[PDB]
Amino acid sequence: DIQMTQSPASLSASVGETVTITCRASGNIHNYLAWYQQKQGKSPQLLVYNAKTLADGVPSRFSGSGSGTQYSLKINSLQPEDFGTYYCHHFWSTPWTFGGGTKLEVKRADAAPTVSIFPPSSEQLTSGGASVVCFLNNFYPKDINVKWKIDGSERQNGVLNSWTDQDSKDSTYSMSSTLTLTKDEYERHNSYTCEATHKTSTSPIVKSFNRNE
Amino acid sequence: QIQLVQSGPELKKPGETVRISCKASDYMTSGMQWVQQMPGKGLKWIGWLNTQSGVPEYAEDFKGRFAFSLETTAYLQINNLKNEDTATYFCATWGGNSAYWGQGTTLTVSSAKTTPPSVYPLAPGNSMVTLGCLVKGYFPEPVTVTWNSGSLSSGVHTFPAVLQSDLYTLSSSVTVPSSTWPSETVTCNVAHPASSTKVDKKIVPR
Ligand SMILES: C[C@]12CC[C@@H]3c4ccc(O)cc4CC[C@H]3[C@@H]1CC[C@@H]2O
Numbered sequence: 581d582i583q584m585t586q587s588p589a590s591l592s593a594s595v596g597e598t599v600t601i602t603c604r605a606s607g608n609i610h611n612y613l614a615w616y617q618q619k620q621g622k623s624p625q626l627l628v629y630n631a632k633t634l635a636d637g638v639p640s641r642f643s644g645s646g647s648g649t650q651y652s653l654k655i656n657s658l659q660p661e662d663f664g665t666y667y668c669h670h671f672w673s674t675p676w677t678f679g680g681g682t683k684l685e686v687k688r689a690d691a692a693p694t695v696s697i698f699p700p701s702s703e704q705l706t707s708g709g710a711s712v713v714c715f716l717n718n719f720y721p722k723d724i725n726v727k728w729k730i731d732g733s734e735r736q737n738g739v740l741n742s743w744t745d746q747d748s749k750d751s752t753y754s755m756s757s758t759l760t761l762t763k764d765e766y767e768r769h770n771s772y773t774c775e776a777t778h779k780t781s782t783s784p785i786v787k788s789f790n791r792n793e
Numbered sequence: 794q795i796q797l798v799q800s801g802p803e804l805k806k807p808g809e810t811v812r813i814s815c816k817a818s819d820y821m822t823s824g825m826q827w828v829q830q831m832p833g834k835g836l837k838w839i840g841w842l843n844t845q846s847g848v849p850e851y852a853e854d855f856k857g858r859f860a861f862s863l864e865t866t867a868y869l870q871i872n873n874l875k876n877e878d879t880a881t882y883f884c885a886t887w888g889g890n891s892a893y894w895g896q897g898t899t900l901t902v903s904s905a906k907t908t909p910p911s912v913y914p915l916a917p918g919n920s921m922v923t924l925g926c927l928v929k930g931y932f933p934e935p936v937t938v939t940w941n942s943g944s945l946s947s948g949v950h951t952f953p954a955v956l957q958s959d960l961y962t963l964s965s966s967v968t969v970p971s972s973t974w975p976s977e978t979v980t981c982n983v984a985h986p987a988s989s990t991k992v993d994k995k996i997v998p999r
Contacts, residue, residue, distance in 0.1 A: 581853075614892070616836070618836075621830075621881070621897075622896075622897075623883060623894040623895065623896055623897055624883070624894055625894070626891055626892040629887075629892070633890070635890060635891040635892065636889070636890045636891045637891075667835065667836050669836070669838070674840075674841075674850045674852070675838055675840070675850075675851075675853065676826070676838050676841065677838060677852075678828075678835060678836045678837065678838060679835075680835050681835045681836070694923070696917075696923045696925075698915040698916065698917070698918070698925065699999075700913075701913040701914050701915070701916075701927075703913055703914070704911070704913045704927075707911070711913070711927055711929070713915055713925065713927055713964055715923060715925065715964075715966050717923065717950075717966060717968075740955045740957060740962065741955070742952040742953050742955050742963065742964075743952070743953070744950055744951075744952055744953065754950055754966070755952075756952040756963075756966070758927070758962070758964065789918035793918070
């Protein structure tokens, strides 16, 4: 069985630039390779097959090359619809394995997150629960860390986080951080603080509130 | 144009069986394949079916519990379902100068009982103000969230749900001018098709 090693796993670039994605087979696949593009979970779309033949409707700025065990997809003068994930797929012998994929994202200027903190709602409090929510919206680059503090002390348990994919409109990222507590637990403390650590600042970017106010 | 349509979302329990159909507008012409994609993961080839010889070929990890059939409609049958089969399944074929993939079919395999979400308003403790809605404890995925029945679409993004003890939770963020809220009402609409549920939560200032 032949496996495909695709690289790089992640790539960042801007409209107008050129990028190259490569795939290497563990055994000769004699040009039996296809390249696919996938947008936010949707059905993958064929770009090139047989290593170098462009599929119908595929812009000529896309081109595949290689032979034996080494192949690559070249994309020059990137267009905004070119950002997403790419996968190579050999079909020389079963199993027709896929490469691990390459995530191509938009490169833009750094942006500090806009932080918003939200105390538990009265409805949830009445039901006995207390979720404190923190939004870290529209920042770039994607790497970021969140740290919660209750009465000045860091809290680590009860925290669940989620991250959006790059925004198709402003190319930024967003993150939500939720600290779930019981009503009693939540009312045993006063100050709740959400702190983000991002490259846009050597200091924490914070937002907090006092249960009393 | 050649179009492959797949059957709707599936919800099953560990150990059960599921059949996913793939119906082509036309059609035996060249053979087809099925592909699996686990949440947030890459594409994984399940196998392909030589529509000519009727002979199928499966990838190691799928032999035994996954079977291809054809009746024109193509089928993917999975028995002895495990939680790990939770993913989106695609059927695909090819011909001429291209390939044709179906829209995909999502499958969720879990012991969890379909449970509607509890929706909570997220209001502030500037010229702009960010509001939100917490959608907690629902199963299975997904839920659709809109603001003011879709009238409020700009400055909006809904975070992916996280799974906490068989149940999913997510939140949605919306940013509007302070001159709009609370003067004008802002409401999030949450729909959970699996339980045929629809909930509206007005964002009221503290
Ligand atoms: C469907 C694939 C891309 C499209 C390829 C194609 C595309 C056009 C055609 O006339 C024949 C073939 C044969 C192999 C196909 C490939 C098998 C693996 C890959 O996913």
